[PDB]
Specification:
113 residues, Immunoglobulin-like, six-stranded mixed beta sheet, three-stranded antiparallel beta sheet, 46% strand, brugada syndrome
Length: 113
């Protein structure tokens, strides 16, 4: 069955990081938006599912990898090759029609070694 599990919030520099986002659903059109915000900055979109997985232009374009389910209850993504600079707040927005909308916040912090 579908369990809602929070994402890890600590990442090791140089490894891939899974930004977990799970929205267990009510027995359906889906939109998923992933946002990132650097310390002292503004949210910008980095990943989108909106009638398909869209190419989103961002500093993240190139290092993102989809890691979710086909049923779209798991909408996790992976950031490849993590740097100290990827620290910040990641937001996962999942909306569902035929209405719902759920938000998940990931205060991501990257470490050495």
């Amino acid at each position: 069955v579908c369990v809602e599990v929070p994402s890890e919030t600590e990442a090791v520099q140089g490894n891939p990081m899974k930004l977990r986002c799970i929205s267990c659903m009510k027995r359906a059109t889906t939109v998923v938006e992933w946002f990132y915000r650097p310390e002292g900055g503004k949210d910008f979109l980095i990943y989108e599912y909106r009638n398909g997985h869209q190419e989103v232009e961002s500093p993240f374009q190139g290092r993102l990898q989809w890691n979710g389910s086909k049923d779209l209850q798991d909408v996790s993504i992976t950031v490849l090759n993590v740097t100290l600079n990827d620290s910040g707040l990641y937001t996962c927005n999942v909306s569902r029609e035929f209405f719902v909308k759920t938000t998940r916040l990931i205060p991501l912090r990257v470490h050495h070694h």
